[PDB]
Structures are given as C-alpha cells and as structure tokens.
Amino acid sequence: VDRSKDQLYVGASQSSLAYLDGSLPGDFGFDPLGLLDPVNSGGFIEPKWLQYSEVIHARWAMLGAAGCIAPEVLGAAGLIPDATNIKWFESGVIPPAGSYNGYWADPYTIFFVEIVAMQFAELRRLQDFRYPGSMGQQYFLGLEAIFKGSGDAAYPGGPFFNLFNLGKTEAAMKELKLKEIKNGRLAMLAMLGYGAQAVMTGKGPFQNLVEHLADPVNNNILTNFAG
Template sequence: MAMMMRKAAAVPASSRRSVAVQSVSGKRTVSGKAPVPEDVLAYAKTLPGVTAPFDNVFDPAGFLATASVKDVRRWRESEVTHGRVAMLAALGFIVGEQLQDFPLFFNFDGRVSGPAIYHFQQIGQGFWEPLLIAIGVAESYRVAIGWATPAGTGFNSLKDDYEPGDLGFDPLGLKPTDAEELKTMQTKELNNGRLAMIAIAAFVAQELVEQTEIFEHLVLRFEKEAILELDDIERDLGLPLTPLPDNLKAI
C-alpha cells in the first residue's frame, strides 16, 4: 500500500487532473474541459455520425458544455441540411462546367461559360424567380414537418417527435427498416455531407485563386506532372528537356 501511495504521489498533479472524470451536479468533466450536462452527452453519443478515428463525441471547441438537448437536435438538423445542400452544390459545380456547351443543356443561348463561380452572374431574368419560389416551397415544407410553433418554449426548436433530417422523402424506398442499418445509412449520409461541405469550399477557393474550372485544373495538373516526368527521363538520357508551358508554371 505504501508503495502504491508513493507511486501515486510521484505523478504530477496536472497529469492527474488531465485524466480526471468527475460528476458534479449532473455534469461530467472530461480531460479538463468545461463540464458537459450528462443528458446532453448521453444524447450526443446516440446520434449517427460518430465515426473513427473519433469514436467518442467529437467536440474540440466545447460547444456541448453550454448546450441543451434541444440545441444539439437543432445543430444536427443544420448539419444534415447543409450537408445535403453541399452535396448538390459540389455535383452542380462539376456538371455545370462540363455541360455548358452541351446542345441539350439549358444554357441561356450560350451566355454561361467559364468557372462555375461566375455562372450566377451570367444568368439573366427568368431563372432566379422560379428558383426562389422552389426554395421557398421546400423550406416551408421542412419547417412544417420538423419545426415547432415559434411561440413560448417552441421558439427556435424542433418538434419533440421529429427526427432531425427525416422529412419523409424516400421515393425509391431505400430507407432501411432495421434500426442499426438505418443508423449506418445516416452516418454515411452525414460523412458524405461533411466531405461535400469541405469540397465545395475548396472548389470555390481554387477557382477564385486560379480562375480555371475544376476539371480543367485537374487536366493541367496531369499535363504538368507528365512533362516533369518526361524531363527526368530526358535528363537521364542527355536529351534536350521539354519546356514547360507558361500556363502550367503557376500550377
């Protein structure tokens, strides 16, 4: 016993505090972070989207410390919705840039061209009005399905019987009936949405910096790598090097 006490005393107090897990007034303090309400932590652990290598709740900014279950449900609704929009946006970026010269593509008499970040500015009247109406109808439907009446405690909160992201839209009948299979599918959707949010941000940043389309940049990158590989071979054989075109030097 004395040996164990001496070993415990040899561990720095800061190290002991860093691994402490305490329960105080219904809250849990983990690894020195601010206390998280136990009901919030328990609910967060049941949600889809918990993925390796983050096998526990991933909250580096400590948002859960000041959150309620109602807040977490609203955040999940926001994450799912933004992920779905980002998946459509990422696909739209690529498809729009590739089909702008396709004869059957609605291209406003050929006025839309170049990187996708400039397509909006090239579209005239007759497109935005129906689009805004369609967005309004879709959002009104989502609010009617999932959001509580904005009065009293229902302000800025979801309905108690609403599952975040579940709008009842399943025209192909793909929704699993098994709870575990459904959670797996929801996790896949969340992860693809998270990747799409990062991707669409990268698409916009890349096109703003380089002023080239996504696939055009990819082709130019491959062309540059091929020329550099060819230069290595020519250098080894003592042959003249293939010059790198000016438009590839900045890539």
C-alpha cells in the first residue's frame, strides 16, 4: 500500500482498474484480492456493503485513535487529575489487564445502557441501508424529520448529521469525503498500532512515543522483542 498520495498505489493491478474508476472516495486502485469486483457479487462481499463498512470502520477508528491517547496527553499536561491518567487498555474494557474503580456504576451496569443505546442507534442505521428513507416515516418523537437519509447509506446528511452544511458544491463534497477517508484509514492503522504496541511493550501509546524520541535506536520494535 503506497503511503502518501499518488494516482495509484503499489498494489494497483490492471485487473482492479476494470471496475475501480475513481467514483468512490479514496479510490487509488489498490485491490489485489479483487473483493470489489461487481461481477457475480453477493452476500456481504459487494461494493455497496464493503464501501459502507470502510467508512463505518473509519469513523469508529478515528474516535478510538483520539480517545485512546487523550487521557495520557491531557494527564501528562496536568489538565486532568492523575487518578484518571490511565492507559486505554486499563480503563476497564479488559479487566484482566486493568480496571478503574470510580465510575458512577459497575462496568456491567454501564454496559447494559450501552447495549440498549446502541441497539437503537445501530438497528435504525441498518434499516436505512435495507430500506432507504424508511426511518423518516414512522413516528419517533418528531425526530424522524432528520432521519430521511440522502440515498447513500454512508452519508446520511440532513439537518443534524450535516449540521453545518459543509461541502455545498459537488467538488467541495468530494474533497471532504477524500479527506475523511484518508484520516479514517490513517486512524485504523493507528488503532492497530495501539493494540500491537500494547502487547509488545505493555505501555500506553504516549509512553512509547516519548521513549522512542529519547533513544530512537535503543527504543523500537527490534529492541522490544526482549527486555
């Protein structure tokens, strides 16, 4: 996967150029396994679902990448009490790695609210993919006015999801989508970096960066194989 920008990436192949025509955001021709070929597609391996899933992964990853390091950066700057300067994997998500006592409820009590809240958010989002525009019809406390969608599942738009109606022009919107995808793809790799770095070193993402800057040669992946 060619880093940076370019017309085509390293893995671009003549076979993938058949259907990759630049219509999708961040379409750099990289599809060595040819999972986006329209011909004889079905199930979840089809262009509409795979492109939709990438954006959803991009947006969750962007929140995760910024949220898995902010407590360490803010804690390092003294803007939050040291009691909350906690590594992302020691928040309580993985109790064996570490858990934080001091939340207003037991982490399982909080999880049930997460289940119910995400059931509504995710199943309503799904129903717009299966039946476009269907969430703007049945009464939902008057909120159905903002759930009418825009025909494209990954980009609902509307009064809320496009609060400040940025990208009014077609050219402007394409650039914003490209910027969203590149930041999202970068964050997805960052999250994978957090997970791999946590296992290899056992420290937070911020600690690894600080140590690397201290002695870059003596602190890197190669030296962390043994300690």
